[PDB]
């Protein structure tokens with residue numbers, strides 16, 4: 001019994017793992033020359049692990065925690081105590097919106113939990129930003145929320161469905177747990193454990209047909225792969241440019257076209273000494289260096305690791321920037337915090353920007369009017385099942401990518 | 413003499429006020445802020461050069477604008493558009509276009525858009541221009557080039573914008589090739605100077621509008637009640653949603669106002685001892701913090717050189733929280749990527765004011781996926797309340813459109 005898995009990111013890898021354990025022959029088809037998709041770890045010469053893709057899970061992410069245990073891996077706690085530079089340096093723990101502004105937000109979150117699907121479709125016509133401004137939240141408070149949500153969405157609240165953001169705020173992601181050896185230890189552990197899996201590299205899927213009890217997937221090279229079932233883990237843009245016979249369901253196609261992938265750019269600097277003056281260092285800014293942090297994984301490392309996460313148009317600013325420019329953006333952020341000292345940079349690692357046709361720059365974001373898109377993207381098409389972070393309950397997370405694989409494999 | 417209330421003193425409100433005043437109607441002009449002109453503002457530099465911190469250019473064929481400028485005894489100047497691009501490498505003006513295949517696809521789509529019914533336009537409007545053109549076979553590289561080509565108008569990513577709206581805009585896309593002698597604020601000041609029988613109320617935002625018994629009653633934050641036979645709103649979309657209306661706005665108009673996203677356009681001028689460019693008619697695009705940089709000088713035989721910078725999107729917030737030293741460095745790094753890394757001899761700097769965006773938008777109304785019909789809804793009168801401003805116009809998001817919107821509203825009084 002052969003099952004085709006399309007895409008070798010963590011959802012594809014976890015699907016392949018679960019299938020292979022039940023004695024199914026898996027045909028895993030990957031567009032690029034590497035497995036792991038939006039997960040990528042660089043081992044620095046210091047022994048520190050640099051997560052250029054997904055770096056954190058939440059302590060309560062059950063799928064991830066269960067798989068990490070199953071595979072004999074280990075997690076480390078990552079303390080989140082973030083300063084903010086906005087107008088002035090604001091110490092960690094001191095810059096949230098006012099308790100009364102939070103009460104308005106809690107009321108709207110509970111309202112979205114209580115209303116029916118028709119009411120939710122109506123609320124989804126409006127951006128979270130415009131909806132909160134209409135409900136009397138200040139521009140100042142909305143800017144604070146934009147920092148607080150930035151490491152998840154990677155884009156402005158002006159871009160996002162009010163309904164989706166209020167839905168997400170029931171159980172908002174926290175980035176407080178790392179995998180020992182970096183997040184690519186998890187992807188590699190899955191790869192090391194596949195049995196009876198043929199992997200095709202550097203050969204994107206261009207067409208999918210189903211009929212006569214078979215799924216046939218054709219790649220760019222002209223290779224035809226047949227199976228009893230297929231699990232798509234492909235990003236939304238690829239669902240629309242692959243040729244399907246028969247055609248994707250009308251709502252699934254529209255839903256793939258509504259998805260807007262956010263733009264999350266990561267830079268690590270390897271430094272001679274600590275540029276921060278406190279433990280558990282992290283800080284937000286509106287500058288090109290949006291979020292900087294002590295990223296070190298090797299607790300007794302001489303070299304120090306400064307991580308930078310920049311979202312939105314900052315991705316394109318950084319993709320255009322030289323290494324000296326990235327160092328300066330980071331030094332200016334440290335200077336506004338009262339540091340400024342010329343950083344002693346030994347090495348640099350940044351995001352790869354050349355294969356975004358296959359590997360999204362960020363996570364699926366849900367603009368106004370996209371209500372229902374996850375349900376439509378998840379819906380099976382006979383023996384073609386759909387997974388990926390954009391199909392999950394906890395969408396846009398490693399947890400969600402993994403949970404999506406279980407949901408698809410359980411249908412066969 | 414009927415009284416007409418004009419809400420907002422940007423160029424649409426000032427032109428409405430001028431038009432009404434010309435026929436002898438008593439106008440009550442209500443402005444939220446301490447200045448008239450709204451998204452138009454000109455700083456006069458000590459060099460004699462005019463710095464347009466707001467709207468800078470009209471198109472040669474913007475007839476509403478050209479006709480009014482002539483009528484107020486003002487003059488225009490030509491602005492040559494020859495824009496370089498830094499994107500991977502320095503690409504000289506005229507050498508950077510989308511692929512011929514992609515240009516053919518875009519030509520056919522812009523043609524298709526004027527030959528499909530309203531059901532088809534509503535369906536196309538569900539998708540972003542970016543995702544639609546990618547689906548239709550345009551490359552990421554082609555879409556990044558269009559993003560530069562359209563940036564001085566929209567001031568935001570094509571990933572934000574209705575496919576339908578952008579295809580509809582491409583039949584007559586705005587070109588920025590004409591400036592006003594003395595800066596754009598010469599026009600707003602000439603309107604202010606030509607008002608007769610106009611009471612101007614400053615620093616007193618409208619908070620409620622009622623209509624009944626053949627009158628419109630407008631109330632301000634201070635509690636002033638102004639009565640009129642008719643009322644022209646030039647207010648931006650967010651203000652329509654927060655003002656209390658009795659009777660209430662039509663559901664489609666309220667939704668339309670809540671769908672509008674205002675782009676974020678930040679402007680800086682450097683006054684320099686020496687030209688940092690090496691050609692005449694200099695301008696250049698990049699993805700850097702300094703998105704569009706240009707020779708902005710207006711004064712002939714100026715010793716002092718004026719470098720203008722327009723930056724959009726998240727660049728607005730980056731710049732709003734930047735020091736003057738950082739702004740200079742963002743501009744020097746943009747010049748360095750074109751081959752001019754020489755230190756700048758900076759005499760003075762002027763930037764965007766960021767503090768009144770509640771009342772004065774940071775950019776132009778943009779129309780995301782799902783916003784099909786918003787302009788028609790925002791324009792629609794409510795008895796003797798008429799709607800104007802750039803977001804109600806055929807050439808929405810321009811000075812021309814703001815001016816045209818005033819004529820359409822005043823004609824109905």
Ligand SMILES: Cc1cc2nc3c(=O)[nH]c(=O)nc-3n(C[C@H](O)[C@H](O)[C@H](O)COP(=O)(O)OP(=O)(O)OC[C@H]3O[C@@H](n4cnc5c(N)ncnc54)[C@H](O)[C@@H]3O)c2cc1C
Nearest residue numbers: 007009010011031037038054055056205388389397398401
């Ligand atoms: C920079 C960044 C930081 C992140 N940080 C975090 C974080 O800290 N924590 C968190 O929980 N989440 C984070 N996320 C989200 C998380 O990375 C993703 O949700 C998750 O890794 C996606 O897994 P996936 O299997 O759904 O997709 P992907 O990892 O994108 O895998 C899809 C695969 O399909 C392949 N493919 C595409 N098209 C084709 C085709 N035509 N044929 C064949 N193969 C194809 C691609 O090459 C890729 O390998 C981050 C995302 C990014 C980009």
Ligand SMILES: Cc1cc2nc3c(=O)[nH]c(=O)nc-3n(C[C@H](O)[C@H](O)[C@H](O)COP(=O)(O)OP(=O)(O)OC[C@H]3O[C@@H](n4cnc5c(N)ncnc54)[C@H](O)[C@@H]3O)c2cc1C
Nearest residue numbers: 420422423424444450451467468469617618801802810811
């Ligand atoms: C930075 C920037 C650059 C631009 N560049 C160009 C360009 O080069 N060429 C071009 O053609 N267009 C350009 N535009 C667009 C152009 O500026 C606008 O289309 C036009 O000026 C808008 O005029 P308006 O009268 O519709 O609105 P505004 O100028 O915004 O006027 C609205 C007025 O209403 C007032 N107001 C708001 N709320 C209330 C209230 N509650 N009560 C009373 N008054 C209130 C405001 O304070 C303001 O004075 C640019 C815009 C910006 C922001």
